[PDB]
Amino acid sequence: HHSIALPAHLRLQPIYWSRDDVAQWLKWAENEFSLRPIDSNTFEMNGKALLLLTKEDFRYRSPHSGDELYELLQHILAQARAAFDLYFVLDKSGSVANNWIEIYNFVQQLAERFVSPEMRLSFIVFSSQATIILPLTGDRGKISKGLEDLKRVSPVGETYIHEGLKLANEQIQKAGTSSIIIALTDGKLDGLVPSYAEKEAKISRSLGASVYAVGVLDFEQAQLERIADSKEQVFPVKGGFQALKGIINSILAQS
């Protein structure tokens, strides 16, 4: 449903709004609802901070329209739906043993940035065999415990990424919402695993999933390009916040 005809730029979940986005929301709300002038500094904060405020905080900051803006923000929350199922397919090979912390801190940060409702996460580790650490769940308690298990992972073995994608595809097929696959690896595949993994990524796209690849160490951009949907969905783990921001904005723009 869409009882409120929200503009496209404000259709993003408010938890991802920036300070400027909050300001644009005030300008839109002021005209759409014939409200009195609203200073653009009534809420000098991002959407994530705005969601922690109380209706009393709205009444104080905006005596003329604070109550209306709060109820407007609540109706927006009840319409802006994520519905993203994120599948982390993490390389726990011996080759990436010294960089597992990178893989972990990258997954941990995205899980915190992806804490919006209707967004469920899943953790899959692969080496010589594949294992599901965290099944697809929106429960933050299970997500928190899964991150604890990812920290205790002892990297060792080969790089059979097709085994990890199969675990993602099966879940995606069983549960069906945009399914997203975030594969963190160096793309160093031995034997026919390159063909196996690219064949398994076609099945993911056949299942309606979007395959992202985050490379670690001296990764093979080529191998990651073929697995991912395109070169634009291949990001470096060393990119830091930029890459984190890029992947999330790209994932959010999928829906």
Numbering used by the authors: 10 to 185, 189 to 267
Q: What do the paper's sentences say?
A:
The ‘TELSAM’ variant of the human translocation ETS leukaemia (TEL) protein sterile alpha motif (SAM) domain is a 75-amino-acid (9 kDa) polymer-forming crystallization chaperone that is soluble at pH > 8. However, when the pH decreases below 7, TELSAM forms a six-subunit-per-turn helical polymer that can enable fused target proteins to co-crystallize. Additionally, pre-ordering many thousands of copies of the target protein along the polymer results in substantial avidity to strengthen the subsequent target protein–target protein interactions that are formed when adjacent TELSAM polymers associate.
No twinning, pseudo-translation or TELSAM-polymer flipping was detected in diffraction data sets from these SUMO tag-free constructs. The interface of vWa with the vWa domain of an adjacent polymer buries 188 Å2 of solvent-accessible surface area. The vWa domain also contacts a second vWa domain, burying 144 Å2 of solvent-accessible surface area. Specifically, the side chain of Ser207 in the vWa domain makes weak contacts with the side chain of Ala265 in this second vWa domain. Prior to cooling, this crystal was briefly (∼10 s) exposed to iodine vapour to label exposed tyrosine side chains. We were also able to resolve the main-chain atoms of two of the histidine residues in the 10×His tag. In the constructs reported here, retaining the 10×His tag during crystallization clearly did not block crystal formation and may have improved the crystal order by limiting the possible binding modes of the target protein to its host TELSAM polymer.
